[PDB]
Amino acid sequence: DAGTVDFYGQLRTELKFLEDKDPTIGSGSSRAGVDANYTVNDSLALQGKVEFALKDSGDMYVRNHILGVKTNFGKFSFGKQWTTSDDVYGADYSYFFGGTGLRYGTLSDALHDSQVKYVYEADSFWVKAGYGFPEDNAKQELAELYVGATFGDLAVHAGGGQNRDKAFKVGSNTVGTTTDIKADVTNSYFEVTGEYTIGDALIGVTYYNAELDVENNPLVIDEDAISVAGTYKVADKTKLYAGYEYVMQEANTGADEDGTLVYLGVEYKFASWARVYAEYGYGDGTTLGYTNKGSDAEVKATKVDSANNFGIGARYYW
Amino acid sequence: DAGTVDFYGQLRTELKFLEDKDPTIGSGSSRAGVDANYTVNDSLALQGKVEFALKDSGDMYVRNHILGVKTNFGKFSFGKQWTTSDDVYGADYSYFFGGTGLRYGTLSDALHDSQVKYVYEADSFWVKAGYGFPEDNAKQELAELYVGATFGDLAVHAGGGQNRDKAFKVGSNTVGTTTDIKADVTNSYFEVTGEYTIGDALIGVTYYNAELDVENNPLVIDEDAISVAGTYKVADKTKLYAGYEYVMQEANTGADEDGTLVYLGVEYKFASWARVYAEYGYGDGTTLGYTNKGSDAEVKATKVDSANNFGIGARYYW
Amino acid sequence: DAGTVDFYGQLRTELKFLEDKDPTIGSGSSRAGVDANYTVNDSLALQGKVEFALKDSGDMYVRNHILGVKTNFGKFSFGKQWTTSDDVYGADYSYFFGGTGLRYGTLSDALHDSQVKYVYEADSFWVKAGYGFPEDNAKQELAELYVGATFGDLAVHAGGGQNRDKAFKVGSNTVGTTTDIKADVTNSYFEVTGEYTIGDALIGVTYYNAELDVENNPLVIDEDAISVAGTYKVADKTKLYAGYEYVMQEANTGADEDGTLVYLGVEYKFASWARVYAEYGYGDGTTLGYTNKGSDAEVKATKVDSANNFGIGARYYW
Ligand SMILES: [Ca+2]
Ligand SMILES: [Ca+2]
Ligand SMILES: [Ca+2]
């Protein structure tokens, strides 16, 4: 009948060496929050949550702001949250680079501030979904559905959704006097994923398919994407990970394109509240845009070459 | 001789349906604060207060930032606070719409960040006042005085003040190239209010009068405003409320104008830390601008028509 | 082997009367933070720190964001911190005006958000240093080294560094259409300081020398600066302080210039968590720009005259 109040956070600190650039030091995506939960009876519980950022860069601001109601019929969560998409994710186990090949948030950056989200667990067969209120085109249209289920040692999921931005930035031409090109884009995407636990080892594979149509315009981009990845706990506190990520983008204009991302890294944990990371990442070719869930990094649509990247992490959790 | 340190807050979450618009979900005006109080002796106590916002929208920022000193001669509070005006308020018992007819903050939005405020309670006959430092026209001129007193079951107040903005936005014409019209406006206002408690019931009536002159210009707007309102606790945790609010604006140019706001709603409280709200609001005609104290909503000067509005609230307090 | 978690802060409130201006009230530089420390063994400790602002003015934001590692070989601190320079400071004991004559941060405002800092204490002979990562000219080049040592009752330090901004604001001409003049400036500075404790009394003297060269341009400004200052605890809770600060700026163009700052004030402390300040400050002539460490005030490059300033402070610490 009573409740729990958890005050939690991370203090990320990163040292990064990215292709063609200088060393950076500073915060990663440090944040701090408060999960408050209260069980009323057996068919009713309540949640109040609010995470905010402690990045070293801009003004500080709220990241998630949530009212949750759990029932017999499932949990409904309301307000500013990450997309159901991002919660489900897919097979990327990096803390820096990588996450390309998951194509759910080309337009969303994994976020919609004005959304309703549903969850339902069972004899671990589960269902998650969400809807984004466009709050009169101040926000994106969003709608997603995923479903999964574990078979003892195998773990599966599939689903997708549809996200649209009426005024999304597609380019720039300045002429002196600097302006960007807006355009109304729809991203309609689907995935399937499997994960296999072999004691220390873990393997994962995801396939993403995705369609970017533009209204008042013939253009269409079919993306088709394969992530394969895994982790292996070696010593007592030590985990290694890696992944290959291959993406192909056909345009309806004929124009074909691809992109490759490879990573290899190590999570050591002095404790659970004290972790350090080291990761290499090789990239070549094109992304249309992606989010690394581990760093919270956004990479906007780009083409890379010859592309080496190292990242050294040190976090304090609470 | 010792002190109290209260860490407090609200986690508002609102679902709103306003005339001619789409559904919104998200935070209302969530905030969080710290009241710190310390009694030194019988003729001396100290306060330190700082509230900040957790809205789901912009950067997060400080709302109130206060140093208070209580004495025999009364409490002096210093720094960023709401106007004495707003503290006193008048008869509006809504959580969303309504608050028109209180005319104290057409220009202030109920706030001055650089003000000194005085309070004095007695054999409950009380006096409140405040002054806003213009800090060289970076801020509004403000000066207010209110006085009240309870007669057992009747509760009265009257007062007003004068607030001026040297560069207040009166309109816009863009021509291609988008610009707004500034103008130096004075709002000089007075009210009287009475409130009557009949066990479960509560009735309230306020009258506001107000004068907007403009310097270097003939224009003047006399507002004259009548709020009447009340609440009635029905069941164990249930309160109902309503109000009629009628405002008339004569201009000195001849031009007459009016505005009507009606509300009806219900506060249910699962507990004191858990409340839910439902409110209807009908509006027709003109406001020159107003603040709803219950939602923290600002409505800028506007004319409405045919105007239906619903609002469903859910807050967690601490 | 365990750790300490300190939640700390200040609630500054200031009332200021500066030459040619109106009274201001409001916050000074209120902030709040969390120092977290953990000793692992005798040759290893860890720190996590994050201070953020509660100013009454803009958005709220992070001030310092730190990962510290202490060893036998010394403490390395990483991320957003004040400059080593500012930590060391020099002889200014004011809470408002004064701090001119310390010339370390003409360009930095005492801050670099992307810096590595080293510290080493001994049989109190100490060494501090730091490097600022230019993170590809998004940030200033910085590099500093200071060293000190106490002789029982005398306390000495000397050092300096070099700080450069590729695009620093040197002026403005608007022509209608408002633009500022950027220019690539280097500030290369050195100091020596001594401090003498005579029970209640304290005396201090600093000398600063500094050179501002500009790339692609003949201009150079030699500053040469003498602060002399002190404090004297009179009654039980009462401290008085004062300082004379004289600065001379030769330009390489011939053009000579100077500036004088004098202060006198009193720190009374009702307790350690409750302090009040009163300070007078006389200024005449030129600063090229400076920071008062006590108020956190930035004064941009300016020439003053006839210049009287009072400041009344009231802080609550925790
Ligand atoms: Ca915790
Ligand atoms: Ca509380
Ligand atoms: Ca403390």
Side-chain angles (χ1 to χ4, degrees), chain A residues 1-54 56-318, chain B residues 1-54 56-318, chain C residues 1-54 56-318:
Chain A
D1 196 45
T4 20
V5 57
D6 186 19
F7 169 59
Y8 73 100
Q10 270 145 106
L11 196 93
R12 279 116 104 119
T13 300
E14 300 172 349
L15 162 52
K16 289 162 80 208
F17 301 83
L18 323 189
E19 164 95 339
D20 300 347
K21 311 282 275 144
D22 291 9
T24 75
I25 16 150
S27 69
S29 186
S30 316
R31 76 288 258 130
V34 160
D35 212 337
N37 291 275
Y38 181 99
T39 36
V40 171
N41 66 55
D42 296 343
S43 72
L44 203 79
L46 303 184
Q47 165 177 49
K49 203 187 187 209
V50 37
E51 192 173 293
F52 57 83
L54 288 343
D56 73 26
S57 337
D59 307 326
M60 87 201 217
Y61 65 100
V62 172
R63 293 153 57 74
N64 278 43
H65 171 303
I66 315 193
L67 179 54
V69 191
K70 203 164 157 285
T71 75
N72 292 326
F73 319 121
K75 188 177 202 193
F76 290 71
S77 281
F78 300 73
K80 182 160 188 177
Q81 322 160 77
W82 315 105
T83 60
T84 299
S85 264
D86 189 65
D87 294 331
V88 177
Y89 209 52
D92 157 49
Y93 313 117
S94 59
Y95 292 90
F96 282 92
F97 321 118
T100 183
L102 308 185
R103 307 308 308 136
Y104 61 87
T106 322
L107 307 174
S108 73
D109 304 319
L111 207 132
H112 197 292
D113 83 341
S114 283
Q115 84 181 314
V116 192
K117 284 167 79 204
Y118 177 72
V119 188
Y120 186 61
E121 284 163 314
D123 208 56
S124 67
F125 147 87
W126 57 258
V127 167
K128 299 146 183 208
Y131 167 83
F133 280 47
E135 295 190 357
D136 300 70
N137 298 326
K139 324 286 172 188
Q140 297 176 337
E141 268 165 48
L142 173 63
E144 302 181 319
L145 164 42
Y146 293 74
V147 39
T150 340
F151 301 173
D153 285 279
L154 183 56
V156 160
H157 58 86
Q162 184 177 280
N163 179 217
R164 178 183 179 172
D165 193 347
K166 305 305 188 77
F168 191 74
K169 176 153 175 289
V170 168
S172 195
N173 75 275
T174 47
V175 190
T177 54
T178 280
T179 308
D180 54 53
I181 298 111
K182 299 310 213 313
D184 178 343
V185 185
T186 296
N187 189 33
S188 351
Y189 47 93
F190 181 82
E191 72 93 17
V192 48
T193 288
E195 284 162 302
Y196 201 40
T197 331
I198 259 62
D200 306 323
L202 169 57
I203 300 298
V205 173
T206 306
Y207 160 84
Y208 251 100
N209 182 269
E211 180 191 298
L212 306 162
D213 198 4
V214 198
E215 294 280 348
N216 310 5
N217 199 274
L219 192 29
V220 179
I221 327 276
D222 295 292
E223 292 190 304
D224 268 280
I226 188 76
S227 301
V228 42
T231 78
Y232 183 94
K233 173 160 157 158
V234 172
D236 179 45
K237 305 147 180 301
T238 304
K239 181 176 194 170
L240 314 205
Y241 54 90
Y244 177 85
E245 306 189 323
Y246 184 67
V247 181
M248 293 191 318
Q249 303 94 353
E250 187 156 58
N252 81 324
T253 215
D256 287 7
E257 195 55 72
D258 72 7
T260 301
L261 198 294
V262 157
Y263 60 96
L264 166 47
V266 69
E267 179 184 52
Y268 188 91
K269 345 203 328 198
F270 298 127
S272 55
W273 56 277
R275 320 203 211 166
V276 309
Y277 304 79
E279 183 177 316
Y280 171 69
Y282 182 79
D284 193 59
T286 298
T287 336
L288 288 170
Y290 92 91
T291 266
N292 174 250
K293 191 158 178 195
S295 57
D296 278 321
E298 159 177 22
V299 186
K300 315 250 188 176
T302 306
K303 179 91 179 287
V304 312
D305 196 356
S306 82
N308 285 24
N309 303 275
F310 313 73
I312 310 308
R315 313 190 168 174
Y316 164 36
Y317 296 65
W318 75 90
Chain B
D1 196 45
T4 20
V5 57
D6 186 19
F7 169 59
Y8 73 100
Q10 270 145 106
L11 196 93
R12 279 116 104 119
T13 300
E14 300 172 349
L15 162 52
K16 289 162 80 208
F17 301 83
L18 323 189
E19 164 95 339
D20 300 347
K21 311 282 275 144
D22 291 9
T24 75
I25 16 150
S27 69
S29 186
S30 316
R31 76 288 258 130
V34 160
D35 212 337
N37 291 275
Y38 181 99
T39 36
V40 171
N41 66 55
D42 296 343
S43 72
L44 203 79
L46 303 184
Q47 165 177 49
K49 203 187 187 209
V50 37
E51 192 173 293
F52 57 83
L54 288 343
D56 73 26
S57 337
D59 307 326
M60 87 201 217
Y61 65 100
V62 172
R63 293 153 57 74
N64 278 43
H65 171 303
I66 315 193
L67 179 54
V69 191
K70 203 164 157 285
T71 75
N72 292 326
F73 319 121
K75 188 177 202 193
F76 290 71
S77 281
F78 300 73
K80 182 160 188 177
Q81 322 160 77
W82 315 105
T83 60
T84 299
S85 264
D86 189 65
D87 294 331
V88 177
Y89 209 52
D92 157 49
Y93 313 117
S94 59
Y95 292 90
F96 282 92
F97 321 118
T100 183
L102 308 185
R103 307 308 308 136
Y104 61 87
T106 322
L107 307 174
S108 73
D109 304 319
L111 207 132
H112 197 292
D113 83 341
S114 283
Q115 84 181 314
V116 192
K117 284 167 79 204
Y118 177 72
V119 188
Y120 186 61
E121 284 163 314
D123 208 56
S124 67
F125 147 87
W126 57 258
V127 167
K128 299 146 183 208
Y131 167 83
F133 280 47
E135 295 190 357
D136 300 70
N137 298 326
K139 324 286 172 188
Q140 297 176 337
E141 268 165 48
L142 173 63
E144 302 181 319
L145 164 42
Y146 293 74
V147 39
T150 340
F151 301 173
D153 285 279
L154 183 56
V156 160
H157 58 86
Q162 184 177 280
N163 179 217
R164 178 183 179 172
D165 193 347
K166 305 305 188 77
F168 191 74
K169 176 153 175 289
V170 168
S172 195
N173 75 275
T174 47
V175 190
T177 54
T178 280
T179 308
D180 54 53
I181 298 111
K182 299 310 213 313
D184 178 343
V185 185
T186 296
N187 189 33
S188 351
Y189 47 93
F190 181 82
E191 72 93 17
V192 48
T193 288
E195 284 162 302
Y196 201 40
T197 331
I198 259 62
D200 306 323
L202 169 57
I203 300 298
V205 173
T206 306
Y207 160 84
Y208 251 100
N209 182 269
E211 180 191 298
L212 306 162
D213 198 4
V214 198
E215 294 280 348
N216 310 5
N217 199 274
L219 192 29
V220 179
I221 327 276
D222 295 292
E223 292 190 304
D224 268 280
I226 188 76
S227 301
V228 42
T231 78
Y232 183 94
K233 173 160 157 158
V234 172
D236 179 45
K237 305 147 180 301
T238 304
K239 181 176 194 170
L240 314 205
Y241 54 90
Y244 177 85
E245 306 189 323
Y246 184 67
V247 181
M248 293 191 318
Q249 303 94 353
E250 187 156 58
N252 81 324
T253 215
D256 287 7
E257 195 55 72
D258 72 7
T260 301
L261 198 294
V262 157
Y263 60 96
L264 166 47
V266 69
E267 179 184 52
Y268 188 91
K269 345 203 328 198
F270 298 127
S272 55
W273 56 277
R275 320 203 211 166
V276 309
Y277 304 79
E279 183 177 316
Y280 171 69
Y282 182 79
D284 193 59
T286 298
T287 336
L288 288 170
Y290 92 91
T291 266
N292 174 250
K293 191 158 178 195
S295 57
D296 278 321
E298 159 177 22
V299 186
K300 315 250 188 176
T302 306
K303 179 91 179 287
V304 312
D305 196 356
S306 82
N308 285 24
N309 303 275
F310 313 73
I312 310 308
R315 313 190 168 174
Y316 164 36
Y317 296 65
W318 75 90
Chain C
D1 196 45
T4 20
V5 57
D6 186 19
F7 169 59
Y8 73 100
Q10 270 145 106
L11 196 93
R12 279 116 104 119
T13 300
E14 300 172 349
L15 162 52
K16 289 162 80 208
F17 301 83
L18 323 189
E19 164 95 339
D20 300 347
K21 311 282 275 144
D22 291 9
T24 75
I25 16 150
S27 69
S29 186
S30 316
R31 76 288 258 130
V34 160
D35 212 337
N37 291 275
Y38 181 99
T39 36
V40 171
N41 66 55
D42 296 343
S43 72
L44 203 79
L46 303 184
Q47 165 177 49
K49 203 187 187 209
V50 37
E51 192 173 293
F52 57 83
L54 288 343
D56 73 26
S57 337
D59 307 326
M60 87 201 217
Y61 65 100
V62 172
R63 293 153 57 74
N64 278 43
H65 171 303
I66 315 193
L67 179 54
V69 191
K70 203 164 157 285
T71 75
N72 292 326
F73 319 121
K75 188 177 202 193
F76 290 71
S77 281
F78 300 73
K80 182 160 188 177
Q81 322 160 77
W82 315 105
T83 60
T84 299
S85 264
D86 189 65
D87 294 331
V88 177
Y89 209 52
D92 157 49
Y93 313 117
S94 59
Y95 292 90
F96 282 92
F97 321 118
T100 183
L102 308 185
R103 307 308 308 136
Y104 61 87
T106 322
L107 307 174
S108 73
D109 304 319
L111 207 132
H112 197 292
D113 83 341
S114 283
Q115 84 181 314
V116 192
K117 284 167 79 204
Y118 177 72
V119 188
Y120 186 61
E121 284 163 314
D123 208 56
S124 67
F125 147 87
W126 57 258
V127 167
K128 299 146 183 208
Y131 167 83
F133 280 47
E135 295 190 357
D136 300 70
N137 298 326
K139 324 286 172 188
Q140 297 176 337
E141 268 165 48
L142 173 63
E144 302 181 319
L145 164 42
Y146 293 74
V147 39
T150 340
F151 301 173
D153 285 279
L154 183 56
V156 160
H157 58 86
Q162 184 177 280
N163 179 217
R164 178 183 179 172
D165 193 347
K166 305 305 188 77
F168 191 74
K169 176 153 175 289
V170 168
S172 195
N173 75 275
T174 47
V175 190
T177 54
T178 280
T179 308
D180 54 53
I181 298 111
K182 299 310 213 313
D184 178 343
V185 185
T186 296
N187 189 33
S188 351
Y189 47 93
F190 181 82
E191 72 93 17
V192 48
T193 288
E195 284 162 302
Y196 201 40
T197 331
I198 259 62
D200 306 323
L202 169 57
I203 300 298
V205 173
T206 306
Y207 160 84
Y208 251 100
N209 182 269
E211 180 191 298
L212 306 162
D213 198 4
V214 198
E215 294 280 348
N216 310 5
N217 199 274
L219 192 29
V220 179
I221 327 276
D222 295 292
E223 292 190 304
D224 268 280
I226 188 76
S227 301
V228 42
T231 78
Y232 183 94
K233 173 160 157 158
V234 172
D236 179 45
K237 305 147 180 301
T238 304
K239 181 176 194 170
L240 314 205
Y241 54 90
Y244 177 85
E245 306 189 323
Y246 184 67
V247 181
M248 293 191 318
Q249 303 94 353
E250 187 156 58
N252 81 324
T253 215
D256 287 7
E257 195 55 72
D258 72 7
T260 301
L261 198 294
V262 157
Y263 60 96
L264 166 47
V266 69
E267 179 184 52
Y268 188 91
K269 345 203 328 198
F270 298 127
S272 55
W273 56 277
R275 320 203 211 166
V276 309
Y277 304 79
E279 183 177 316
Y280 171 69
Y282 182 79
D284 193 59
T286 298
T287 336
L288 288 170
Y290 92 91
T291 266
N292 174 250
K293 191 158 178 195
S295 57
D296 278 321
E298 159 177 22
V299 186
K300 315 250 188 176
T302 306
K303 179 91 179 287
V304 312
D305 196 356
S306 82
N308 285 24
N309 303 275
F310 313 73
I312 310 308
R315 313 190 168 174
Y316 164 36
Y317 296 65
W318 75 90

PDB file of all heavy atoms in Angstrom, chain B residues 5-16:
ATOM      1  N   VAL B   5      12.969  23.702   7.481  1.00  0.00           N
ATOM      2  CA  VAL B   5      13.374  23.637   6.076  1.00  0.00           C
ATOM      3  C   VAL B   5      12.361  22.746   5.325  1.00  0.00           C
ATOM      4  O   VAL B   5      12.404  21.534   5.472  1.00  0.00           O
ATOM      5  CB  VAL B   5      14.859  23.154   5.908  1.00  0.00           C
ATOM      6  CG1 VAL B   5      15.150  21.784   6.543  1.00  0.00           C
ATOM      7  CG2 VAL B   5      15.261  23.134   4.448  1.00  0.00           C
ATOM      8  N   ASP B   6      11.436  23.348   4.560  1.00  0.00           N
ATOM      9  CA  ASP B   6      10.487  22.582   3.713  1.00  0.00           C
ATOM     10  C   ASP B   6      10.875  22.527   2.202  1.00  0.00           C
ATOM     11  O   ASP B   6      10.889  23.547   1.528  1.00  0.00           O
ATOM     12  CB  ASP B   6       9.066  23.148   3.859  1.00  0.00           C
ATOM     13  CG  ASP B   6       8.007  22.306   3.118  1.00  0.00           C
ATOM     14  OD1 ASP B   6       8.249  21.113   2.778  1.00  0.00           O
ATOM     15  OD2 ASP B   6       6.910  22.846   2.887  1.00  0.00           O
ATOM     16  N   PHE B   7      11.182  21.331   1.704  1.00  0.00           N
ATOM     17  CA  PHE B   7      11.340  21.064   0.290  1.00  0.00           C
ATOM     18  C   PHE B   7       9.946  20.654  -0.198  1.00  0.00           C
ATOM     19  O   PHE B   7       9.409  19.654   0.276  1.00  0.00           O
ATOM     20  CB  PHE B   7      12.397  19.965   0.052  1.00  0.00           C
ATOM     21  CG  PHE B   7      12.450  19.430  -1.387  1.00  0.00           C
ATOM     22  CD1 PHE B   7      12.706  20.276  -2.467  1.00  0.00           C
ATOM     23  CD2 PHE B   7      12.260  18.065  -1.660  1.00  0.00           C
ATOM     24  CE1 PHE B   7      12.741  19.783  -3.762  1.00  0.00           C
ATOM     25  CE2 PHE B   7      12.312  17.568  -2.961  1.00  0.00           C
ATOM     26  CZ  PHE B   7      12.554  18.429  -4.007  1.00  0.00           C
ATOM     27  N   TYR B   8       9.372  21.438  -1.130  1.00  0.00           N
ATOM     28  CA  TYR B   8       7.981  21.300  -1.632  1.00  0.00           C
ATOM     29  C   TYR B   8       7.888  21.356  -3.192  1.00  0.00           C
ATOM     30  O   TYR B   8       8.846  21.716  -3.889  1.00  0.00           O
ATOM     31  CB  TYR B   8       7.072  22.391  -1.005  1.00  0.00           C
ATOM     32  CG  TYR B   8       7.319  23.769  -1.548  1.00  0.00           C
ATOM     33  CD1 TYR B   8       6.479  24.325  -2.530  1.00  0.00           C
ATOM     34  CD2 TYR B   8       8.426  24.508  -1.125  1.00  0.00           C
ATOM     35  CE1 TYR B   8       6.733  25.594  -3.061  1.00  0.00           C
ATOM     36  CE2 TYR B   8       8.694  25.766  -1.649  1.00  0.00           C
ATOM     37  CZ  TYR B   8       7.849  26.311  -2.622  1.00  0.00           C
ATOM     38  OH  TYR B   8       8.135  27.571  -3.111  1.00  0.00           O
ATOM     39  N   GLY B   9       6.723  20.993  -3.717  1.00  0.00           N
ATOM     40  CA  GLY B   9       6.491  21.018  -5.124  1.00  0.00           C
ATOM     41  C   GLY B   9       5.149  20.531  -5.614  1.00  0.00           C
ATOM     42  O   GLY B   9       4.319  20.074  -4.848  1.00  0.00           O
ATOM     43  N   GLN B  10       4.946  20.692  -6.922  1.00  0.00           N
ATOM     44  CA  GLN B  10       3.809  20.136  -7.665  1.00  0.00           C
ATOM     45  C   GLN B  10       4.276  19.535  -8.965  1.00  0.00           C
ATOM     46  O   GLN B  10       5.204  20.049  -9.571  1.00  0.00           O
ATOM     47  CB  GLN B  10       2.790  21.216  -7.973  1.00  0.00           C
ATOM     48  CG  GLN B  10       1.756  21.358  -6.898  1.00  0.00           C
ATOM     49  CD  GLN B  10       1.325  22.765  -6.697  1.00  0.00           C
ATOM     50  OE1 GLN B  10       0.241  23.151  -7.093  1.00  0.00           O
ATOM     51  NE2 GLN B  10       2.173  23.541  -6.059  1.00  0.00           N
ATOM     52  N   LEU B  11       3.618  18.453  -9.380  1.00  0.00           N
ATOM     53  CA  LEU B  11       3.843  17.838 -10.674  1.00  0.00           C
ATOM     54  C   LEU B  11       2.522  17.869 -11.404  1.00  0.00           C
ATOM     55  O   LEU B  11       1.807  16.885 -11.451  1.00  0.00           O
ATOM     56  CB  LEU B  11       4.379  16.408 -10.528  1.00  0.00           C
ATOM     57  CG  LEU B  11       5.007  15.807 -11.808  1.00  0.00           C
ATOM     58  CD1 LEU B  11       6.513  16.024 -11.874  1.00  0.00           C
ATOM     59  CD2 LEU B  11       4.737  14.318 -11.926  1.00  0.00           C
ATOM     60  N   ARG B  12       2.203  19.016 -11.982  1.00  0.00           N
ATOM     61  CA  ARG B  12       0.977  19.154 -12.780  1.00  0.00           C
ATOM     62  C   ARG B  12       1.044  18.473 -14.125  1.00  0.00           C
ATOM     63  O   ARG B  12       2.082  18.497 -14.780  1.00  0.00           O
ATOM     64  CB  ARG B  12       0.608  20.606 -13.029  1.00  0.00           C
ATOM     65  CG  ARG B  12      -0.094  21.213 -11.841  1.00  0.00           C
ATOM     66  CD  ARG B  12       0.710  22.322 -11.258  1.00  0.00           C
ATOM     67  NE  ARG B  12       0.117  23.598 -11.638  1.00  0.00           N
ATOM     68  CZ  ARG B  12      -0.361  24.512 -10.793  1.00  0.00           C
ATOM     69  NH1 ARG B  12      -0.313  24.305  -9.484  1.00  0.00           N
ATOM     70  NH2 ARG B  12      -0.842  25.675 -11.268  1.00  0.00           N
ATOM     71  N   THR B  13      -0.095  17.891 -14.511  1.00  0.00           N
ATOM     72  CA  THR B  13      -0.289  17.222 -15.767  1.00  0.00           C
ATOM     73  C   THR B  13      -1.721  17.491 -16.220  1.00  0.00           C
ATOM     74  O   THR B  13      -2.656  17.208 -15.506  1.00  0.00           O
ATOM     75  CB  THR B  13      -0.053  15.742 -15.593  1.00  0.00           C
ATOM     76  OG1 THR B  13       1.287  15.535 -15.132  1.00  0.00           O
ATOM     77  CG2 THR B  13      -0.286  15.007 -16.892  1.00  0.00           C
ATOM     78  N   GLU B  14      -1.872  18.073 -17.404  1.00  0.00           N
ATOM     79  CA  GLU B  14      -3.137  18.621 -17.843  1.00  0.00           C
ATOM     80  C   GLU B  14      -3.464  18.052 -19.212  1.00  0.00           C
ATOM     81  O   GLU B  14      -2.560  17.713 -19.978  1.00  0.00           O
ATOM     82  CB  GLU B  14      -3.079  20.163 -17.839  1.00  0.00           C
ATOM     83  CG  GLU B  14      -2.795  20.744 -16.430  1.00  0.00           C
ATOM     84  CD  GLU B  14      -2.543  22.255 -16.364  1.00  0.00           C
ATOM     85  OE1 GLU B  14      -2.369  22.905 -17.426  1.00  0.00           O
ATOM     86  OE2 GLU B  14      -2.496  22.782 -15.221  1.00  0.00           O
ATOM     87  N   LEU B  15      -4.759  17.888 -19.474  1.00  0.00           N
ATOM     88  CA  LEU B  15      -5.261  17.488 -20.780  1.00  0.00           C
ATOM     89  C   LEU B  15      -6.331  18.504 -21.145  1.00  0.00           C
ATOM     90  O   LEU B  15      -7.346  18.596 -20.441  1.00  0.00           O
ATOM     91  CB  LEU B  15      -5.829  16.076 -20.708  1.00  0.00           C
ATOM     92  CG  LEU B  15      -6.774  15.557 -21.802  1.00  0.00           C
ATOM     93  CD1 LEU B  15      -6.214  15.739 -23.213  1.00  0.00           C
ATOM     94  CD2 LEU B  15      -7.113  14.094 -21.535  1.00  0.00           C
ATOM     95  N   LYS B  16      -6.098  19.274 -22.215  1.00  0.00           N
ATOM     96  CA  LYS B  16      -6.920  20.446 -22.491  1.00  0.00           C
ATOM     97  C   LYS B  16      -7.507  20.470 -23.889  1.00  0.00           C
ATOM     98  O   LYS B  16      -6.821  20.190 -24.868  1.00  0.00           O
ATOM     99  CB  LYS B  16      -6.108  21.725 -22.271  1.00  0.00           C
ATOM    100  CG  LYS B  16      -5.796  22.041 -20.814  1.00  0.00           C
ATOM    101  CD  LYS B  16      -4.653  23.038 -20.630  1.00  0.00           C
ATOM    102  CE  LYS B  16      -5.085  24.470 -20.827  1.00  0.00           C
ATOM    103  NZ  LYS B  16      -3.987  25.368 -21.300  1.00  0.00           N
TER     104      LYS B  16
END
